[PDB]
């Protein structure tokens, strides 16, 4: 299935580039029928997707 | 393969007489063969048969 739509919405809601969005890989079914920002905003709070942290860039 | 050798030489008159020389050689390993068959040839005006 095309999880692209869910990825773009998960970037706008989280306010981060879609590199960082992490759609869960084992649960591609429940995301597939969540295609409105009234559910993806819900779908985050249950942890089924999250925002990946920035890759480290150490000045040490 | 190939390998060196060192020998004297006794060519009379050469500027190399009675001195060492090194000379690249081969090594052709030759186990003894085994005879199994005989063939006879007859001369024909056409050729050998």
């Amino acid at each position: 299935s095309m999880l692209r739509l869910q990825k773009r919405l998960a970037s706008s809601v989280l306010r981060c580039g879609k590199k960082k969005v992490w759609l869960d890989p084992n649960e591609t079914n429940e995301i597939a029928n969540a295609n409105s920002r009234q559910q993806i905003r819900k779908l985050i709070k249950d942890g089924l997707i999250i925002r990946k942290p920035v890759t480290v860039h150490s000045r040490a | 393969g190939m390998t060196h050798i060192v020998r004297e030489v006794d060519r009379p008159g050469s500027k190399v007489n009675k001195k060492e020389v090194v000379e690249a050689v081969t090594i052709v390993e030759t186990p003894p063969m085994v005879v199994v068959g005989i063939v006879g040839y007859v001369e024909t005006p056409r050729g050998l048969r």
Binding site: - | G13, S14, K15, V16, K19, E20, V21, V22
Partner: protein, 131 residues
């Protein structure tokens, strides 16, 4: 006898070789090896111990600007003896000579290849050390 077993020719026409005697020259400019018949489009090459015509390009004004026969003493190209040791000196070298085969100067600095000392006995008389 007259053996001169092939030694790797390493100074083609154009080689500038340090003069090695007291005639006052400092550079021999080879123009043509002596004794080479050659092939279409091949520069003659002068080995060690080969008479070779040469025009001094830097030294006594008497010597410069004329063609003098020369002999190559030390060559930089590693040449083989006939016993498997590849002797090669530190620089090109030479010495002015008459076409009768005898030196013009009387003091050679540096070593001399054993190939020369066997060929031109006049050079082998003045050689400091036949290396």
């Amino acid at each position: 006898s007259g053996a001169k077993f092939r030694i790797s020719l390493g100074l083609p026409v154009g080689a500038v070789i340090n003069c090695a005697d007291n005639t006052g020259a400092k550079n021999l400019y080879i123009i043509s090896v002596k004794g080479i018949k050659g092939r279409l489009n091949r520069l003659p090459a002068a080995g060690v111990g080969d008479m070779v015509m040469a025009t001094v390009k830097k030294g006594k004004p008497e010597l410069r600007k004329k063609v003098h026969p020369a002999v190559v003493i030390r060559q930089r190209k590693s040449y083989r003896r006939k016993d498997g040791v590849f002797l090669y000196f530190e620089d090109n070298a030479g010495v002015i000579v008459n076409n009768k085969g005898e030196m013009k100067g009387s003091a050679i600095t540096g070593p001399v290849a054993k190939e020369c000392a066997d060929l031109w006995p006049r050079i082998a008389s003045n050689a400091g050390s036949i290396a």
